[PDB]
Symmetry: C2
Subunit: 74 residues, 2 copies
C-alpha cells in the first residue's frame, strides 16, 4: 500500500519484482503471476507499475502487461 | 540516471510523471511526450516505467506505452 509493486521486464520470459523495497530477480512468468496475484489479493489498492530495459522489445512489454491482466492485476 | 522516470496513467489523455522524485500532474499526451523526450535525450540510460490506476483500462495503458515508442523512449 505505502510502497508500490514494481515489475521489471529483463528479457524473454525473465522478470524482476520490487515489493515494498525488496527486489526479487530471476523470476519466471508463472512465478511472477503467483507473487503478483498474492499481493493483489492481500491488498486490493496496491499501485502496480511495469517497466522494461532498453534491450527489451516493446512487444515483450505488451506480453507482461497482458499477463497481469490475465491474473486480474491490471 | 540514479532515480528512474515514472509515467502514471490517470485516465483518458491525463497523465502524471515522476522525475527524480519530482511529480508533475495534469499533463497532456503531447506535453508528456515533450518531457519524456527531453529526459531521454539528456540521459540515454534513464530507466523508464509505466503504471496505471485501477480505474484505467488496460487498453489505455497500451496507448501510453505506444506513445513512448513513437517518441523512441521504449
Amino acid at each position: 500500500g505505502s510502497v508500490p509493486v514494481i515489475l521489471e521486464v529483463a528479457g524473454i520470459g525473465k522478470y524482476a519484482i520490487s515489493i515494498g523495497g525488496e527486489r526479487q530477480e530471476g523470476l519466471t512468468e508463472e512465478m511472477v503471476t503467483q507473487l503478483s496475484r498474492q499481493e493483489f489479493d492481500k491488498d486490493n489498492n496496491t499501485l502496480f507499475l511495469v517497466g522494461g530495459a532498453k534491450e527489451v522489445p516493446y512487444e515483450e512489454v505488451i506480453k507482461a502487461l497482458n499477463l497481469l491482466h490475465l491474473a486480474g492485476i491490471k
